[PDB]
Amino acid sequence: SSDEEFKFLATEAKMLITAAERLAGTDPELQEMVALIKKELEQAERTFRNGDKSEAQRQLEFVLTAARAVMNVAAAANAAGTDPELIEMVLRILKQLKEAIRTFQNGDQEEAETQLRFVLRAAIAVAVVAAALVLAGTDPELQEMVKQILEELKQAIETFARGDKEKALTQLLFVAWAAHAVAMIAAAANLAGTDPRLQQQVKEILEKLKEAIETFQKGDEEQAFRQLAEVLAEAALVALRAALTN
Amino acid sequence: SSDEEFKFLATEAKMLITAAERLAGTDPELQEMVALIKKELEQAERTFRNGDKSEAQRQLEFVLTAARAVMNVAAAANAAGTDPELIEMVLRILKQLKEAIRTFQNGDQEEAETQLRFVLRAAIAVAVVAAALVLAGTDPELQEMVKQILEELKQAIETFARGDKEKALTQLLFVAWAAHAVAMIAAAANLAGTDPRLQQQVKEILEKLKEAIETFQKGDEEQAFRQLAEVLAEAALVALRAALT
C-alpha cells in the first residue's frame, strides 16, 4: 500500500523482536516462538523486494502484532518467576499464538488476524498481571486479587477455545482493565510505604475493584464496565499520589 | 461490519471516556475535548440504531482511538502538574487531536485516521514521560533524560506540522520506546531504594539509553533503533530485579 509505511512497520517489528530475543533468555519455547516470528518478518521483506508489495505489507502487519505479543509473553515469563499459575497461562497464550501463525501461513488470514487480536490482548494482560504480583510483594490481599484476575483470564481463554469468541472477547476486555487496575493499586501500595493515609486509600479502592468484578459475575455487564473504568482512574490517581511522596 | 464488534467497541470506548472524565479533573480544556468525543460516540450509537451500521462502526472505530488519546492526555496533564515542558506538549497534542476530530466531521475520514495514528502514539508517549518524571523525583540524571525525550517529542510534533509526516513518525516511534525506557528505569531507581549495587545497574542502563538517543541524533537510525530496543529489555529486567528486593 505504501513503501514508506512498510519501512516504518519493519523498523518497529525488528525492535519488538530484538527486545523479545533478550527477554526470552534461555527458555527454548520463547526462543522458538521469536525465531518463528522473526523468519516471518524476513519472509515479508523478501516478498517486498521481489513480488507483491501490498501482500508483503499485510504479512508484515500480522508479523508486527505477533512480535508485540511474544515480547509481552516473554516479559510475562520473566516476571512470573516460578509461579505455576502464571507459567501455565504463558504456555496457553503461546500455543494459541503458534496456532494463529500457522493459520496465517496456511492462507486463512482473516481467522489468524481475528485470533491474534485476542492473543495480543491476552499477552499484554498476563504481562501486567505478572508485574502486579511482583509489585504486590507479600501482601495477601493484593496477591488474592491478582490470583482472582488470573482465573478470569483463564476462563476467557477457555471460552475462546470452546467456540464462543464474542463472549470471550467481552470477558478479556474486562480482564485487561482489571489487570491494569490491580497493577496500579499494587504499585500504589508499594510507593505508599508506611504512610497510613495512602495505605487506607489503597484498601478502599481495592474493595471497589472486587465489587466491580462481582458485578460482572452477577450479570450486570453495563454497570460492571462502568465501575471498572472508575476503579482504573482512581488506581492511577492513588499511584500518582503515592509516587509524589517519594 | 458486525453488531457484536460494534457493541464491543462501544463498551470499550465508554470506558475510556469515563476514565478520561475523572483524570481531567477541573481542567476546562480537557473536559471540553472529552465532551466532544463523547458526543461523537453517541452520534455513532444513533447511526447504528437508525442508519448505516457499517458507517456507524467506522465512526466508532475513530471514536475509540480519539477516546484513548484524550484519556492519555488527561493522565499526562494530571501527572505533569505545573511542569511547563510537559504542559506545553499536552496542549499541542490536545490541539492536534481537536483538528483531527473536526477533519473527520468534515467528511475527510482518511486524513483524520492518519492524524490519529500520530496523535494517539504521541498522547501515550507524553503520558509515559509524565509518569517517568514523577517517579524520577529529584534525581538530576533522570530529570535530564526525561527532558531530552521531551525535546525529541517536540521536534516530532513540529516536523509533523511542517509537512514531513514520514520523518516525524520515525522520530515519534523512537520517542515512544525511549519514553517507555525511562519510565522503567525510573521505576527501577525507585524500587532499588538504598541498594548501591542495584543503583549502579540502573545508572549504567540509563547511560546506555543516552547513547541510544545520541546515535539517533547523529543520523544512524538503524543502529540507534537496535540500541533502544536492547535498552528497553534491560530496563524491564532491572526494574524486575529491583522490585524483588
Numbering used by the authors:
A (entry chain A): -1 to 244
B (entry chain B): -1 to 243
Tell me what the authors wrote about this structure, in their words:
To investigate the photophysics of special pairs independently of the complexities of native photosynthetic proteins, and as a first step toward creating synthetic photosystems for new energy conversion technologies, we designed C2-symmetric proteins that hold two chlorophyll molecules in closely juxtaposed arrangements. For Chl dimer protein scaffolds, we chose hyperstable C2-symmetric repeat protein dimers containing symmetric pockets with tunable sizes and geometries. In this dimeric repeat protein architecture, the hydrophobic core is independent of the small molecule-binding site, enabling full customization for binding with little impact on the overall protein structure. We describe de novo-designed proteins that hold Chl dimers in precisely defined, closely juxtaposed geometries.
SP2 was intended to assemble a ZnPPaM dimer with a conformation substantially different from that of native special pairs to investigate the effect of dimer geometry. The SP2 crystal structure was solved in both the apo state and the ZnPPaM-bound state to 2.4 and 2.5 Å resolution, respectively. The apo- and holo-state amino acid backbones both agree with the SP2 design model to within 1.4 Å r.m.s.d. Compared with the apo-state crystal structure, the SP2 binding cavity widens by ~1.6 Å in the presence of ZnPPaM; this expansion provides the extra volume needed for the ZnPPaM molecules to adopt their unexpected conformation.
